[PDB]
Design a protein around this ligand. Structure first.
Ligand SMILES: Nc1ncnc2c1ncn2[C@@H]1O[C@H](COP(=O)(O)OP(=O)(O)O)[C@@H](O)[C@H]1O
Ligand SMILES: Nc1ncnc2c1ncn2[C@@H]1O[C@H](COP(=O)(O)OP(=O)(O)O)[C@@H](O)[C@H]1O
Ligand SMILES: Nc1ncnc2c1ncn2[C@@H]1O[C@H](COP(=O)(O)OP(=O)(O)O)[C@@H](O)[C@H]1O
Ligand SMILES: Nc1ncnc2c1ncn2[C@@H]1O[C@H](COP(=O)(O)OP(=O)(O)O)[C@@H](O)[C@H]1O
Ligand SMILES: [Mg+2]
Ligand SMILES: [Mg+2]
Ligand SMILES: [Mg+2]
Ligand SMILES: [Mg+2]
Lengths: 48, 446, 439, 443, 426
């Protein structure tokens, strides 16, 4: 923790929104199956 | 839009030709080469016909003979609705797509299909968006008053489109280009009614686009896509990620076969439109024998877009083989294809091209500098003077006078060397720089 | 809205029972010996009586090897499998090329399978309700579900799994389904038109009301090769948790097929054919530009031809006394080693003649729907006879372009000479490139 | 023809099953001659079948088409089943993700044979019909009604809440383990076939087994140890048995498995089964492969390899020097040689007739003798193709017998290699050299 | 402090007419190279044209890379100089051409003004279904968490008494820590005590964080939301650089065009660098031959020097500087002359002054003699060793003994070669 805390200052420069939910498959609109989105967000809730 | 300030190749806009397929001596920048421009017009009529396939033509001859100018003129002269593939053959190698996969991707991208889809709309100022509860008798009493300038009308939501409006948080009064088979309602902003509202002072903050068309009308929307998008859709359930990032992943053959059948029957059913474009490639002498066999079979194939292939070098070594043949290509493909030779320029067309370059760069030249540039270019090459004009203009600013005078071109000539100057300078310094062995005699004395 | 590319002018060999050919038929003119041999070979193929036959033909460029290949492919019909791919496609990246050659042999051999299936389909009514018979909370195992269809309604209850399938489809009372009883799951036709119009708008399709009696029954016949089965078995098809979605989102790569899978697929296909489900057909393999292959393939094929399931292959090399690509001293006719030619025979595909070439040009004019004059046709044919037919073939279309720009529908000597001037050939480039100061 | 196998170039030859005397016959099982070769092959096959001595080697030489691959296939057929045969060619070891050395090691690991036995226990016929008197499972005893004994089984903490596990209507045949095991359904009963019209995919109906319940069942498996290596390669290494992503198996797993098989053999749970290796045309292989095998073929588990090649004085791939047979002296020292001989007329005609029988092809005297002449001046493979093409001609000629007509038509329309070379040398004008030297011009 | 052979150069020294002084800001002679560099500097300062490149040819220690650093430090901070060597273009997971275009896209600077806001406050409640009731110094507002960012909030162990720096536009959450208001919880509490942030929770600022073309390329190609769990999967599934194709290139061109036409943004060009193009193969030369024939390729400089040597990637292409003839014919040559005795004197003098070496007159002259006798670099590498030797041999100045000890200790290539022809073993 002491080796991971202080130096964490670097910030990646550019980010574009709506490019991660479009990649995981969880969203309000995707070509992948919709039978997982609820259980997938529950996993995200409680996946260590 | 299309941010590109200037280039040595941004000086031609649309080429120039006539209905007789005859060249224009000053055809919108590019000049001379009557055979080249007539052949360009012949190929233009060929591609407008859209009735032949598997044709390969070789732009032979010495380099600098307007070959890139010819390609650019053809590309800008054919017009829109026909995307091209103008990529040099050097970057065919990749760490994600094999040579066969890359060639197949190029070939399938060269041939396009337009698709007309009879999508719908519901346009009009939706002044209110009421979402009633899911009553048992009627599962959704959702009021929403879409009305254009022509009429006043109300509608009803079928318990599916409530979040379609507000997938992104928008309000009512938004022109909605709704699609029945989409589920993603697109809001165009704000809209107007034809009412004066209340009696006291008001009607403030209303200046937007008002709906103009009918409340509903069919739209046969046309979309143009290449085989790349369709194939990446076939390979993976999500295809936009690989279209953007670029990690398709060498899709398999039965996909291409089923797409072939599907496109054939779609054309037969009157739903799609075939657009058989033409592929452009460069540095064919550098191409390798496996690519030679690939194109050899492709030419004999029933589906093959026309080919614009050129070898700048003449009688050069054939890459991928142990033997050298004319054009860097063996006689098999050489006889299979057709040949158009290209010869060099005289000085006057260089002068005209440089004058066009100058007036494109909106610089007040003086004709003495132009004459010096013409002499320097004709002595060595066109590109020499094409850069000399710009550097002399820079020197013109550096001496605080707008006109490009003699001393600007003279300083440009003396400062930056020439190919003959460089070779003379290095052959007299055979023991001063790094050489074959790398022997550098830094020792000026002793 | 048509495109003819050096073909579509050929539709068959044009033979008879007695091996009699036709001088001008099926897009083929001449080649009595080649047509006779091809007819004999395809007659042997149609019997499905053998496997692993091979043949090499000696034919120069433009002599008609590809035309013969296309004609023979069309002889067996669309249903008989074929996969003639370029000889430079063997050298792949993600899989060793001998494995690819095995994969192509697996693809080539064909089969015809079938299956009969039933299916039920809107929903008339609905009555849901077994005992735990112990410490369990309850036992739900039967629900009466309506089945409207069009020609008669037959509601019926089944295993509860069909009930959970009904909830999985999320179908309302006025919603049509398509439930194949073989699995008990749901295939969704969509919503219905009867209980529809509950609102002025609906993104979900109303969907036409199903037509016919609900207890639908049918049979399907599909001709599928074995490599599709292999690749389907290789990757997962279902799943609900993270592994399935990540694997499907992952991009599969070409791999090596294990021989134990070959044994398994042979066993299962034998079991299915013994029940009358599938019927057997061999395949056809063709490779062009074979002389560029290396000695290791040319010697592995020596034993690969002994494979008992390998279909008939056709071998095509155009060169002569050449060394196999990668051989220091293994020089052979057509670039194929003698220890390989000791397993097959030789045919001779020869070039064409004067009347033959002029008829070829005329027929290409016909398929290109252009009118050709006698003088221009004879000039094209003659200069093809001296140098090359393909020159005239590639000059036909631009000459038609010139004629159209001249507002005429025929080729005149002017058009052909203008195309000759504006478009050179290999021979004129054999004596012009040397005098080029700039390369 | 259990699988979709159609025909072989040598399908008549299935087994080097020499007689009890092992003295070769002029004709046997379709093969003729190879007398001393067949005797030595029988000796080698017996030595392999011994299953007590490893690290042997035999080399095969001679011109091809002499039944060498047929020789190996007949040896494999005479070895029977339960002995998997490693079908690997020379051009299969230069793989991408598998280096040649450990690829050979994997081939040997597949080549080994082993047997494994195991014993388990189950209960059969449990038509249960639970009925108890809510939850809690008060007085948790279940009726069990199979064909032989029909009683009530008492349960405990693990079953009174294990019967509420696998929630069933208790009108079906079920299995439980009397050795403290879980509950597994084997299917419903025929009375349950009619209750639901379209049974779900899970629900199948099987009769109550006709017998008792407590079944102690023994099972036997024949799985190569490399399969176990693939299984235990990762935490869940079951998907990789068929995909092929082994990944250059480490030697620590190899020696651990060797120790495990040794200790199980000493325990009697496992016993070995001999294996063979065979690769054709060993000459077109790297000198590194020969160097590796010359050491790896004397290990404790060293199955014999069926060396075979036909080249002459050449260079071993991976070197420069001239070598015997294109093979190193080290490999040409620790082995024994099998050689073939030029064909004679009698076996040529007999083999042609046998092939015609295998192809369901009738050959008369004239065609047989002419094709024997072809197969003696040329090789026999040309005549083996010509019988097929001539039968095709005949069945197109409205007859089944093959005679001078079809044979002569084939001879005219199919070219001999020597005359093909002569035609090439006399028509080189139309052909192409390495430098692309082609005379496209005609007139 | 530390000095590594540079930082002595501090500009060309061009006057109002672009003419540099003789020895100013670390410079010696080479008026041709200085004048050509000044001309290129003026052309770049024009900021109108693009797609032109030059090479400067000179031997070792001729000031080529020195002039490159001079032009770099002359251009200034905002306009970037891109240094790259022929060994750099040999990448691992992507092809060399794509690497060259990545360098080209990141070369051009693009001043942009995008917007960021941050929610920062003390949490008051959380309502699972999401509420995060951030309480700042004067504001207490409750956002809604999307399920993904709700999970990220859950993993942040944030409870009553915690402040988080959760950005508004990116959305990622960075907890600030336990509230300083609840400092009376434990006299030795582990968590840091941070007070309630000033202003409203939804603090808004105007930022000038610019973007290079590669930056906004990786923004959508590989999204980097960061702290949220779904952002972790997004940056974990494809953490590397993917082969961006021309389609995304055109999409990016449209996006940057609309952003620059929004009005606040602007464009500035840049300079790229290549050293020793002689080692480059024919493939990259041929590809760049058709790549410079475009409208976007920015300015690059070449530094190479070879005689009649075969171009790498070929076997028969013999040309000066190891450059293929076509590239030479389409590229501008700048000449450099060998350094002279007086130039060597001044070079050693300045290199002693920067290294805080008060080398006296005769020592400087003798060092110049060695510089003129074997090589400039041989004399230059001895300034620090001779000073340290005199320090160990108790001499503030550098007597001839120190330089003789250096010349018998640290030999040059010529003396080692003289040794090498007389040895029983290599
Ligand atoms: N006829 C021409 N008219 C105008 N510009 C030309 C002409 N020929 C060449 N150029 C210029 O030269 C560049 C292309 O060089 P080019 O002569 O095509 O070389 P190559 O013939 O070897 O392809 C273009 O940027 C163009 O501006
Ligand atoms: N005997 C023939 N009759 C009609 N057309 C022919 C004949 N032989 C060749 N052709 C035509 O010539 C064209 C080129 O033939 P090609 O495939 O190059 O022959 P090869 O495979 O021998 O090189 C083909 O499109 C084909 O239609
Ligand atoms: N003794 C024999 N009896 C019957 N047929 C034989 C005999 N010897 C050879 N043949 C035939 O000759 C062929 C020999 O081929 P083979 O030697 O296996 O090829 P390779 O030399 O490539 O291994 C077989 O197809 C077989 O039908
Ligand atoms: N004009 C100059 N003024 C000061 N130092 C210079 C000058 N030219 C070269 N040098 C020094 O000589 C060394 C070599 O110069 P550099 O341009 O980096 O490489 P090269 O000249 O060998 O291509 C550098 O370390 C630099 O400090
Ligand atoms: Mg050019
Ligand atoms: Mg071909
Ligand atoms: Mg063999
Ligand atoms: Mg330098």
């Amino acid at each position: 923790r002491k080796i991971i805390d202080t130096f964490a200052v670097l910030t990646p420069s550019a980010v574009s929104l709506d490019m991660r939910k479009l990649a995981l498959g969880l969203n309000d609109d995707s070509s992948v199956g919709e039978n997982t989105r609820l259980k997938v967000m529950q996993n995200c809730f409680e996946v260590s | 839009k299309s941010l590109s300030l200037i280039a040595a190749h941004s000086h031609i806009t649309g080429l120039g030709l006539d209905e007789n397929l005859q060249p224009r001596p000053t055809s919108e920048g590019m000049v001379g080469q009557l055979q080249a421009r007539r052949a360009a017009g012949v190929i233009l009529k060929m591609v407008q016909n859209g009735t032949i396939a598997g044709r390969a033509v070789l732009v032979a001859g010495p380099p600098s003979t307007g070959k890139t100018a010819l390609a650019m003129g053809v590309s800008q002269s054919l017009g829109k609705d026909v995307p091209f593939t103008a990529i040099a053959g050097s970057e065919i190698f990749s760490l994600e797509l094999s040579k066969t996969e890359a060639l197949t991707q190029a070939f399938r991208k060269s041939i396009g299909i337009k698709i007309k889809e009879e999508t719908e709309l519901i346009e009009g100022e939706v002044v209110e968006i009421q979402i009633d509860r899911s009553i048992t008798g009627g599962h959704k009493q959702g009021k929403l008053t879409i009305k254009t300038t022509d009429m006043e009308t109300i509608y009803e939501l079928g318990n599916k489109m409530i979040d379609g409006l507000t997938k992104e948080k928008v309000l009512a009064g938004d022109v909605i280009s709704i699609d029945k088979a989409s589920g993603k309602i697109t809001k165009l902003g704000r809209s107007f009614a034809r009412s004066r509202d209340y009696d006291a002072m008001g009607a403030d903050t209303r200046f937007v686009q008002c709906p103009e068309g009918e409340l509903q009308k069919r739209k046969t929307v046309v979309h143009t896509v290449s085989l790349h998008e369709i194939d990446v859709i076939n390979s993976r359930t999500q295809g936009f990620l690989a279209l953007f990032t670029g990690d398709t992943g060498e899709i398999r053959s039965e996909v291409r076969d089923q797409i072939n059948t599907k496109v054939a029957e779609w054309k037969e059913e009157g739903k799609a439109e075939i657009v058989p474009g033409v592929l452009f490639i460069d540095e064919v002498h550098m191409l390798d024998i496996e690519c030679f066999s690939f194109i050899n079979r492709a030419l004999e194939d029933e589906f093959a877009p026309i080919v614009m292939m050129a070898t700048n070098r003449g009688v050069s070594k054939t890459r991928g083989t142990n033997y050298k043949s004319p054009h860097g290509l063996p006689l098999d493909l050489l006889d299979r294809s057709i040949i158009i030779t290209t010869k060099s320029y005289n000085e006057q067309e260089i002068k005209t091209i440089l004058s066009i370059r100058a007036q494109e760069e909106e610089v007040e030249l003086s004709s003495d500098a132009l004459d010096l540039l013409t002499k320097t270019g004709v002595e060595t090459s066109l590109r020499y003077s094409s850069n000399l004009i710009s550097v002399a203009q820079q020197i013109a600013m550096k001496r605080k006078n707008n006109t490009v005078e003699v001393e600007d071109v003279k300083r440009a000539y003396l400062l930056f060397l020439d190919s003959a100057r460089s070779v003379k300078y290095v052959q007299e310094n055979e023991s001063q720089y790094i050489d074959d062995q790398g022997n550098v005699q830094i020792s000026i004395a002793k | 809205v048509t495109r003819t590319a050096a073909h579509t002018h050929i539709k068959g060999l044009g033979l008879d029972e007695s091996g009699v050919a036709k001088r001008v038929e099926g897009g083929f003119v001449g080649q009595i010996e080649a047509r006779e041999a091809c007819g004999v070979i395809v007659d042997l193929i149609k019997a499905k009586k053998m496997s692993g036959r091979a043949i090499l033909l000696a034919g120069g460029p433009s002599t008609g090897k590809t035309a013969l290949a296309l004609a023979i492919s069309q002889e067996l019909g669309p249903k008989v499998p074929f996969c003639p791919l370029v000889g430079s496609e063997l050298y792949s990246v993600e899989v060793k090329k001998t494995e690819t050659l095995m994969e192509n042999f697996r693809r080539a051999i064909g089969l015809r399978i079938k299956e009969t299936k039933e299916v039920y389909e809107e929903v008339t009514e609905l009555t849901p309700e077994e005992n735990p018979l112990g410490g369990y909370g309850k036992t739900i195992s039967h629900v009466i579900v309506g089945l409207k269809s069009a020609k008669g309604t037959k509601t019926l209850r089944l295993d509860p799994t069909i009930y959970e399938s009904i909830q999985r489809e999320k179908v309302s009372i006025g919603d049509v389904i398509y439930i194949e009883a073989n699995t008990g799951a749901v295939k969704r036709v969509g919503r219905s038109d009867a209980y529809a119009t509950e609102f002025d708008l609906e993104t979900e399709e109303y969907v036409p009301l199903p037509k016919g009696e609900v207890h639908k029954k049918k049979e399907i016949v599909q001709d599928v090769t074995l490599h599709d089965l292999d690749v389907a078995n290789a990757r997962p098809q279902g799943g609900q948790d993270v592994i399935s979605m990540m694997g499907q989102l992952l991009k599969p790569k070409k791999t090596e097929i294990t021989e134990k899978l070959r044994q398994e697929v042979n066993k299962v296909v034998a079991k299915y054919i013994d029940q009358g489900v599938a019927e057997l057909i061999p395949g056809v393999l063709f490779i062009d530009e074979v002389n560029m292959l290396d000695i290791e393939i040319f010697t592995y094929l020596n034993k690969a031809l002994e494979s008992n399931i390998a279909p008939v292959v056709v071998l095509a090399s155009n060169r002569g006394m050449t060394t196999v690509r990668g051989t220091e001293d293994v020089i052979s006719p057509h670039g194929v080693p003698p220890d390989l030619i000791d397993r097959l025979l030789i045919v001779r595909t020869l070039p064409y003649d004067k009347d033959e070439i002029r008829t070829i040009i005329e027929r290409r004019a016909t398929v290109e729907r252009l009118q050709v004059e006698s003088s221009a046709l004879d000039l094209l044919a003659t200069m093809g006879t001296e140098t090359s037919l393909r020159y005239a073939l590639q000059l036909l279309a631009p000459c038609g372009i010139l004629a159209q720009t001249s507002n005429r529908k025929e080729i005149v000597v002017n058009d052909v000479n203008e195309a000759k001037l504006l478009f050179l050939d290999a021979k004129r480039s054999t004596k012009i490139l040397e005098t080029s100061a700039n390369y």
